[PDB]
Amino acid sequence: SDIYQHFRKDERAFIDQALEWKRIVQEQYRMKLTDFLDPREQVILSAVTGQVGLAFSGGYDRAERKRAILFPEYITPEESDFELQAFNVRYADKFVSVDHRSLLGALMGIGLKRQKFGDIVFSETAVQLIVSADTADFVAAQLTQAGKAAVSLEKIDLSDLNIVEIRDDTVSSLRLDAVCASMSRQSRQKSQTLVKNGLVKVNWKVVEDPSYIVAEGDMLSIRGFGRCSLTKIEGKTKKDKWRVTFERQ
RNA sequence: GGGGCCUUAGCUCAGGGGAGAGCGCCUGCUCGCAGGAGGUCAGCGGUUCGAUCCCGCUAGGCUCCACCA
RNA sequence: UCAUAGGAUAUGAGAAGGCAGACCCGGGGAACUGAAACAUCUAAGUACCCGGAGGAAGAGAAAGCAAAUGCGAUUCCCUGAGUAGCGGCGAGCGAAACGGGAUCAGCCCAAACCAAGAGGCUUGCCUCUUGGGGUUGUAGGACACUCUGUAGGAGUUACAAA
RNA sequence: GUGGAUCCUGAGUACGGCGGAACACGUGAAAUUCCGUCGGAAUCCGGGAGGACCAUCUCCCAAGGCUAAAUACUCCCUAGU
RNA sequence: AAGCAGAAGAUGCGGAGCCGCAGCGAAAGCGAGUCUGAAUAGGGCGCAAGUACGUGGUCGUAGACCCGAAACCAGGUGAUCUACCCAUGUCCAGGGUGAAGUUAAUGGAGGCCCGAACCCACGCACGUUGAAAAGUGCGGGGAUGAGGU
RNA sequence: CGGGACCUAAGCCGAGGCCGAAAGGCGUAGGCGAUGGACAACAGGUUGAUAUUCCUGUACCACCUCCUCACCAUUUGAGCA
RNA sequence: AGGCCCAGGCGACUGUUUAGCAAAAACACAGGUCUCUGCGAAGCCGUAAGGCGAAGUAUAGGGGCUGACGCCUGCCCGGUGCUGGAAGGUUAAGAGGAGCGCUUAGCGUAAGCGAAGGUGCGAAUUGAAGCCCCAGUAAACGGCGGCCGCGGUCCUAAGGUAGCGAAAUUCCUUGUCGGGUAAGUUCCGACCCGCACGAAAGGCGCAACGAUCUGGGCACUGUCUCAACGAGAGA
RNA sequence: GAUAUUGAAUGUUGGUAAUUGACCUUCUAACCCGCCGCCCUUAUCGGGCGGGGAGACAGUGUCAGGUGGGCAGUUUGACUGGGGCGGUCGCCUCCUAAAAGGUAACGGAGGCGCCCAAAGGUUCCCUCAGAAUGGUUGGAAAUCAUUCGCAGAGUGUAAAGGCACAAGGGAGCUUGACUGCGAGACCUACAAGUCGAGCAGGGACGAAAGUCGGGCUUAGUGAUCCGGUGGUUCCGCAUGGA
Numbered sequence A: 001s002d003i004y005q006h007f008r009k010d011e012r013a014f015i016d017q018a019l020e021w022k023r024i025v026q027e028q029y030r031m032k033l034t035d036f037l038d039p040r041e042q043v044i045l046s047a048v049t050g051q052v053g054l055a056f057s058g059g060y061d062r063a064e065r066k067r068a069i070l071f072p073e074y075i076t077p078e079e080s081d082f083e084l085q086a087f088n089v090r091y092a093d094k095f096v097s098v099d100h101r102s103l104l105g106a107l108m109g110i111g112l113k114r115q116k117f118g119d120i121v122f123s124e125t126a127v128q129l130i131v132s133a134d135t136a137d138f139v140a141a142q143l144t145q146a147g148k149a150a151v152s153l154e155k156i157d158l159s160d161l162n163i164v165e166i167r168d169d170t171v172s173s174l175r176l177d178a179v180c181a182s183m184s185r186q187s188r189q190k191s192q193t194l195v196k197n198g199l200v201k202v203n204w205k206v207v208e209d210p211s212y213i214v215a216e217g218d219m220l221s222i223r224g225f226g227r228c229s230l231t232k233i234e235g236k237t238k239k240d241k242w243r244v245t246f247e248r249q
Numbered sequence B: 001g002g003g004g005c006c007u008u009a010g011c012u013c014a015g016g017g018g019a020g021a022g023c024g025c026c027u028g029c030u031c032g033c034a035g036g037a038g039g040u041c042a043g044c045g046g047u048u049c050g051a052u053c054c055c056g057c058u059a060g061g062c063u064c065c066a067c068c069a
Numbered sequence C: 001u002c003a004u005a006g007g008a009u010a011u012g013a014g015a016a017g018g019c020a021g022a023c024c025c026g027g028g029g030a031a032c033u034g035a036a037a038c039a040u041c042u043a044a045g046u047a048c049c050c051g052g053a054g055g056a057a058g059a060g061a062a063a064g065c066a067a068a069u070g071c072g073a074u075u076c077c078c079u080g081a082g083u084a085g086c087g088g089c090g091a092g093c094g095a096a097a098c099g100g101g102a103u104c105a106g107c108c109c110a111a112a113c114c115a116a117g118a119g120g121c122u123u124g125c126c127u128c129u130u131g132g133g134g135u136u137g138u139a140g141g142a143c144a145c146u147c148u149g150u151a152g153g154a155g156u157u158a159c160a161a162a
Numbered sequence D: 001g002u003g004g005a006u007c008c009u010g011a012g013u014a015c016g017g018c019g020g021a022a023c024a025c026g027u028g029a030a031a032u033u034c035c036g037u038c039g040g041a042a043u044c045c046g047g048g049a050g051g052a053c054c055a056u057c058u059c060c061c062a063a064g065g066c067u068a069a070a071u072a073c074u075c076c077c078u079a080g081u
Numbered sequence E: 001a002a003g004c005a006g007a008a009g010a011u012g013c014g015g016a017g018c019c020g021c022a023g024c025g026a027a028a029g030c031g032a033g034u035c036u037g038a039a040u041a042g043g044g045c046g047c048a049a050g051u052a053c054g055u056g057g058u059c060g061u062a063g064a065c066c067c068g069a070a071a072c073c074a075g076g077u078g079a080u081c082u083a084c085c086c087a088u089g090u091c092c093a094g095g096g097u098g099a100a101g102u103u104a105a106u107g108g109a110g111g112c113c114c115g116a117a118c119c120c121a122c123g124c125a126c127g128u129u130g131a132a133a134a135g136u137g138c139g140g141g142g143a144u145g146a147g148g149u
Numbered sequence F: 001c002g003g004g005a006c007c008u009a010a011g012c013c014g015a016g017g018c019c020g021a022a023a024g025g026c027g028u029a030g031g032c033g034a035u036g037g038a039c040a041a042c043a044g045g046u047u048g049a050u051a052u053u054c055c056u057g058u059a060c061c062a063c064c065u066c067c068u069c070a071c072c073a074u075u076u077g078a079g080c081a
Numbered sequence G: 001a002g003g004c005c006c007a008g009g010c011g012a013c014u015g016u017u018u019a020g021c022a023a024a025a026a027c028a029c030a031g032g033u034c035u036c037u038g039c040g041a042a043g044c045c046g047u048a049a050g051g052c053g054a055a056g057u058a059u060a061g062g063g064g065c066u067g068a069c070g071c072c073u074g075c076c077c078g079g080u081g082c083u084g085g086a087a088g089g090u091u092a093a094g095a096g097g098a099g100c101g102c103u104u105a106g107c108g109u110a111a112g113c114g115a116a117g118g119u120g121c122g123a124a125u126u127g128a129a130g131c132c133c134c135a136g137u138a139a140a141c142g143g144c145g146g147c148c149g150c151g152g153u154c155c156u157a158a159g160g161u162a163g164c165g166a167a168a169u170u171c172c173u174u175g176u177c178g179g180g181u182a183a184g185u186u187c188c189g190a191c192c193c194g195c196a197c198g199a200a201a202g203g204c205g206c207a208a209c210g211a212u213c214u215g216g217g218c219a220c221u222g223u224c225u226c227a228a229c230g231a232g233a234g235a
Numbered sequence H: 001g002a003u004a005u006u007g008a009a010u011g012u013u014g015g016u017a018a019u020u021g022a023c024c025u026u027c028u029a030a031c032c033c034g035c036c037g038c039c040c041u042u043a044u045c046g047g048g049c050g051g052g053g054a055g056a057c058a059g060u061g062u063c064a065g066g067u068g069g070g071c072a073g074u075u076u077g078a079c080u081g082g083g084g085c086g087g088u089c090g091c092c093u094c095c096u097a098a099a100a101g102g103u104a105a106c107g108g109a110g111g112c113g114c115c116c117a118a119a120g121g122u123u124c125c126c127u128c129a130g131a132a133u134g135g136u137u138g139g140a141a142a143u144c145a146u147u148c149g150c151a152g153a154g155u156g157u158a159a160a161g162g163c164a165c166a167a168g169g170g171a172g173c174u175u176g177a178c179u180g181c182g183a184g185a186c187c188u189a190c191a192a193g194u195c196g197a198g199c200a201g202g203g204a205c206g207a208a209a210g211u212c213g214g215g216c217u218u219a220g221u222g223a224u225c226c227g228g229u230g231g232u233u234c235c236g237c238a239u240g241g242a
């Protein structure tokens, strides 16, 4: 009841369900695997669960959408308890190209919910996707086209997964509106519109406060400029602006 | 009057090593591209191997003081 | 309910209060001041308040001092010595023992145990109250032994008390 | 006076931790003494002290009491300086 | 020296104690030397008249040449003045206005009005070694109230 | 007449009691405490100096019984309370 | 035995106050609001006992601010306070003793090693409130922008709304214009470049009230032009 | 918050070999009641007795942390053409400074709170700035070459005094940027500061003479107390240790 204040009002929905997962693992003494919780929902769950222990794995290390195991003080989990299936996306690579937008659009097009798949990995040699094992056969059967490319899915082990723009700058403050303006190369008044409407996120939390102070190692997500990361804050200049470093995706 | 701070390209700002970056403005190309435009670095005189970034002064603009009989 | 609380009556040269503005032992306890400021510190356990006294008080018969072919209760004086030491190691604070003197004195219990009685029988055990017993350190006492005294010695200043 | 079969010889004490005070000694290397609090012995094959502490040695026997004199003082009284 | 004897004396006794006769070194220690140092070196400090008592000068600790704060602390004494409160009394000439209510009249409200006592103290003058350590005179405010006493 | 031998308010004191280094603080029963309640005497006269106080006249209140009279009554028995 | 009138500031009012240089625009006030307080209330006095609160009980009691009435009371929760709180971080005594030192029975030609006990330190681990942190809250403390050409741009927690404005606030200033006067640094009304108003440390109005402050009139006068005479007290 | 007062049970979860912890719930008997009835007792005190409530909590004690101008004791510099405000405070160099030395002002100018493992030591060798004339890049100015050339350069750094038998530049080998000291001087209120031949130990460089106890010279620093570290033929509170 006195947890919601710490999160947003829309985020209440997840928090209610996150409390219902903790309820199970305490009383029934059994691990609860979840449906690839979003990077934000990782942060929320971590809080709602409390310290019921928690584990998280999205197949490869550095998956955005990862599935969480809520386990007690015993039954420390394995890599396959997360019920993850990796696939290699086969297509006529010489003729057609698959991009992240097309493959994401195709996954959604076959009716797959965002919670039923993790990250879509693009390397030089392979395009791979990670899904929940319960949906693996459905996705393999239905995902026959991505954009203009005819595609097929080959099952692989997680071990077979084939896993910047540094921009040293100065800002007046570490307010959100100031950092966005700097990163996105805009007027601050324009950046304030972005923040206020609800287009910027900070670690996948929608921050609508222009004056929110941004810390070192915060993934900002300006809808319109993509995504960028305050990696370094490096003291202050002669004329008193924060020496900073940005790295766009 | 005294102290304290400021003076960089159209605009916003980076920056003892020979003055940049974005945006605007121009180049051709149709939300990104592709090269330009533009600086007495307030000025002055000097420290020196070179000064926007030393150091001393002059502007100007702000800021704080100018009290006690 | 037994009781007990409470109430009543009797007997008490029982207490109370005072002061000598002193001395003594306790409880509580400043500040100015000094430190060339000031907080630790100092002033000072002072002043002051309170309680208790007594003609004196307090201390006192080694769980001591010491480091000798030792000393032998305590108190007080001389000395040790402005030493040792303590100390924003500042300002300041400051011993003790030995040595020399004054004066001198040593005692009683508690306990073991014994005897008698009482009330809890916990049922031959336990607790309590009188009297005896006993009093200490290279241990003493109980307890046993054999001795020995029961009236010479001691006494109201402790060591019983008129 | 002689014996050491047993028994007795001061317990919520000594002592310790924490917090204070007293010791010339200000927490210090800090013995010793006392108070509050909490913990808490041994008991003669025992215990205490000798300035942290241990060992050895030496000296002593706490946690019960009493005790004159030498000492302090003078509102007074007497005699005097 | 205390102390004992002795006029509250001198004095006698009393050698514990004190200072000096040897220094050097932090110290163990060594000693006319010693410390430093590897050193017979060099250098430091030493070697090569005190003491007891008295007078005087000065210093220390004491109030310390005398007089003087504003203050600080401790323990008492004061609410007969004054502040507020509590209990219980008491005071407020006269006149006016005319709320509610009642049936234009009636009615008699009020930190209501004018205005003595009473309370107050706004202005000015006077007084200022006063009549008076806060007043007097002329005016002034409140005067049934959060009133005076 | 005013006060006491009557009453109580505020407050104060306070057996036992509660609390507190000491001293003490607080407080019950119970008291004290008028500024309040209650309560019987008036007019005139008089002295240099007192007067509901003395004097004159006429009163009233409480209490008492050597007495007088009437009435009621001696254990459902007056009456007091 | 009332002088009166016109106009303005302040405070609504009657009250109250610096005994003895200030009576006021200061305090109080009825009204408003915020807040605490479930009763052995909170608050307060007292070491406590005992009390007040109250012989009351949320329509009550305490505290803060505001100050009749009328219209109203804007924006900012970053900071500070208050209230509440999830993760994460931090943190006392106490608890806990892994280790280590000193000591020495023993053991070693010595050097040194070294049981047990005593003793002196002692790490991990554990450990509340609080704090960091997060959320709310402005009739809480407070704060309510620059620059350039309504737009741009920088900065901020957010940039002053309504109303008022040379004001008990305006330095410059005797601002400017108008009114009143023969002549008006004061006064009144406008204006707004508000040095440095502004919404309960309330804003703007406001009838009644004032020994309030301020400007102007009528009346009146020895206040004055400008003095003169008389009475009394002192001299 | 710990701990005492402070107990009993049931669960559950630690840690030791069945005892002792931790926490949850329950219990009643301590403790509490500014609740009711009864009694002491004419009593809204107090106490006793019986109900009820609450309960090992609270309260109180000790200890601990937090908060805490509610309260307490204090501090809050000096110079200064009055004080405040501004500026300054130690060290070095120059000028003022009057041809020894010293010498003031909120007089005039600047530096310092280091740097360097060579930018120290020694041995050997050397000479700089700039200009003229000639040169593919290449220019006024890089690199040659020639002549001229008291220094017009350099000397880690401020300035002054010095320095070309170099104190300036280069190279080799090195660690004397030594230990013990020190006749005697300078400076000086003290405290400190400065110079020093020479002696010993053991070195570096050099054939040797010799030079070397940092740097061309003069700034580059801070008393005591207290505490840390290393060393130590010292002391060690009966003795041996500590």
Ligand SMILES: [K+]
Residues within 6 Å of the ligand: none
């Ligand atoms: K010598």
Ligand SMILES: [K+]
Residues within 6 Å of the ligand: none
């Ligand atoms: K003398």
Ligand SMILES: [K+]
Residues within 6 Å of the ligand: H081
């Ligand atoms: K002057």
